[PDB]
């Protein structure tokens, strides 16, 4: 690409991205919920900037937060999202606010279940947190099996 280009599209291939970046250009991989498409293609209809949804989960994994595709949420991931709550323990890490104070499982039944889980799977580091034995096999939770990083 002889001249620099500044472009916002969705999910460009790696070679197109490097071909743009070699020129001194720019690429930002925007990824939009349907409402986003209608609001960009028909800007005149909406006078005020209106609260726009974050795209869904699988698309956030693969596109918006991907440095390789150069998605637009990468800063947000590297600043806000990748850090847990400051109080949060390891088990309660994923929760927005820790449901209890103490990290230890707070129910005798839940504790019995965690013991059984840690002897079920052999004792691996992550075994503390319960993961259910059964699956969805649904496409909205699946991520990349293997590919170039």
């Amino acid at each position: 690409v002889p001249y620099p280009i500044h472009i916002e599209l969705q999910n460009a291939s790696a070679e197109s991205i490097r071909l743009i970046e070699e020129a001194g250009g720019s690429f930002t991989c925007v990824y939009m919920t349907h409402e986003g498409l209608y609001q960009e293609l028909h800007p005149e209809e909406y006078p005020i900037f209106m609260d726009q949804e974050l795209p869904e989960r699988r698309g956030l994994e693969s596109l918006a937060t991907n440095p390789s595709k150069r998605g637009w949420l990468t800063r947000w991931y590297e600043d806000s999202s990748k850090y847990a709550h400051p109080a949060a323990g390891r088990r309660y890490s994923h929760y927005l606010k820790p449901p209890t104070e103490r990290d230890f499982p707070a129910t005798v039944e839940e504790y019995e279940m965690v013991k059984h889980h840690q002897k079920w799977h052999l004792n691996q580091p992550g075994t503390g947190t319960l993961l259910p034995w059964h699956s969805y096999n649904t496409a909205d939770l699946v991520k990349r099996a293997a590919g170039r990083l």
């Binding site: 960009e40 800007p43 990468t74």
Partner: protein
């Protein structure tokens, strides 16, 4: 959002560095077309929202003062079709008014770097066939672009010159004096 030349909202969140771009001279010729036909459109909306009756037949003449639009509809036509058309036109206007600010700068940089003659000669879009689309009488000896290719002055020799004469006895009729060709009829 996007739709101006600056960038969308999700590049501000993204923090991509778009600011020190290279400025080039782009005439913005397509947008002027789109603007012409946007501004053409806005006015039409103002006309068709503002129709009122003038009925030229007596049975239909009881309505002659009223708007052709029901007020409840005229309002909605003002919101939906009309005042958003103004916004479209508005966007085109912005995208040109950015770029005159940029083209001024390109012209100044090239005026300093080159000089007015060289600069203005480089910033000219002239194609060697631009006379074909603008003043074709300067292009005639270059190519034959006519739909009448038999009447172009290079091929003009082909069309026949009749010898014709007017007649008073026929009522002002002009008539070709050329003899007809005898035709092959039989085998």
């Amino acid at each position: 959002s996007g739709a101006f030349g600056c960038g969308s909202y999700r590049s501000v969140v993204a923090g991509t560095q778009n600011v020190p771009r290279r400025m080039t001279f782009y005439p913005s010729a397509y947008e002027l077309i789109q603007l012409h036909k946007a501004h053409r459109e806005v006015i039409r909306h103002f006309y068709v929202r503002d129709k009122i009756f003038d009925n030229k037949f007596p049975g239909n003449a009881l309505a002659n003062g009223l708007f052709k639009f029901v007020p409840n509809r005229r309002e909605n036509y003002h919101m939906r079709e009309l005042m958003e058309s103004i916004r479209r036109r508005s966007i085109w206007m912005h995208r040109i008014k950015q770029q005159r600010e940029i083209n001024a700068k390109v012209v100044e940089n090239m005026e300093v770097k080159y000089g007015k003659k060289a600069a203005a000669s480089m910033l000219c879009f002239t194609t060697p066939d631009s006379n074909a689309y603008f003043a074709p009488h300067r292009y005639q000896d270059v190519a034959n672009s006519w739909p009448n290719y038999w009447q172009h002055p290079s091929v003009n020799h082909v069309v026949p010159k009749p010898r014709w004469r007017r007649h008073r006895e026929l009522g002002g009729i002009t008539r070709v004096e050329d003899p007809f060709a005898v035709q092959a009829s039989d085998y």
